[PDB]
């Protein structure tokens, strides 16, 4: 991707106003309920999942993980090379799972931001997640 200055500003703004501790756990628990086959990773009901500290911890890690991408928007695939290997090689996370998660991150953000999550905002945010998802799932390009 060739980022426009407006995209960089939008992504920077979203991340600076996001409360990771709130958004992270929500996005991951939402992902575990909507695509329950992802639950296998955090077992090492819905109510249970939502309050599970292990789920919360990784959800927060995911958001901090996106931050290094936000820090260097032009070196994303390189930035996530190691995390990609970890999730496939050691964790056996199916590469399709990154896209499912992300949609859940976008949906939880949309709920937090409400009408401030404009179309232009959604476009920039989803484009940034797409690039990260490609690097994690190691897509051919």
């Amino acid at each position: 991707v060739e980022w426009t200055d407006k995209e960089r500003s939008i992504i920077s703004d979203i991340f600076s106003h996001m409360d990771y501790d709130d958004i992270g756990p929500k996005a991951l628990s939402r992902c575990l309920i909507v695509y329950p086959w992802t639950q296998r990773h955090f077992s090492g009901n819905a109510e249970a999942i939502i309050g599970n500290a292990n789920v919360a911890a990784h959800g927060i890690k995911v958001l901090h993980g996106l931050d290094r991408g936000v820090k260097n928007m032009d070196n994303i695939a390189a930035t996530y090379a190691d995390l990609s290997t970890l999730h496939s090689e050691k964790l056996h996370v199916d590469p399709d799972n990154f896209k499912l998660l992300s949609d859940c991150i976008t949906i939880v953000l949309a709920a937090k931001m409400g009408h401030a999550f404009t179309a232009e905002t959604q476009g920039a945010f989803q484009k940034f997640l797409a690039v990260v998802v490609s690097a994690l799932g190691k897509q051919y390009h």
Binding site: S29, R30, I33, V34, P36, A46, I50, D103, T106, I107, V108, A110, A111, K112, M113, G114, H115, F117, A119, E120, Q122, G123, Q126
Partner: protein, 142 residues
Amino acid sequence: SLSDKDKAAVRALWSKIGKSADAIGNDALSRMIVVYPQTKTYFSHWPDVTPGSPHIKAHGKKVMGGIALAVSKIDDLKTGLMELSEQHAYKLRVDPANFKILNHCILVVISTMFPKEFTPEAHVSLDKFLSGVALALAERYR
């Protein structure tokens, strides 16, 4: 397939948000066109196709009325949406890959408008429902 649990969840959610169907459609349609530019071409016959557009607004009512129809026909989406499938396949020739795109935009809009009602449990059943709606709209394609 939709279970009785899924059907009940979708009817309960629609009962709660249905009042805002027009606004949901205008917003979902606006987002689609902007975020997935390959979709703009189907609406190029309209004088104005931007988020603010009066055409977008009018059609958004029709899109969510089709979703309302889907909710009433939830027990048999194939039969209930057959005429809309025929229309999209034969008359409008809308590439079927786009149904899941509009569905995602509808989930995003419902989330921005009803954060309280759109819980993860409402989301799983509505997503299975929208997948069923997309498969039903794809009925006449091949």
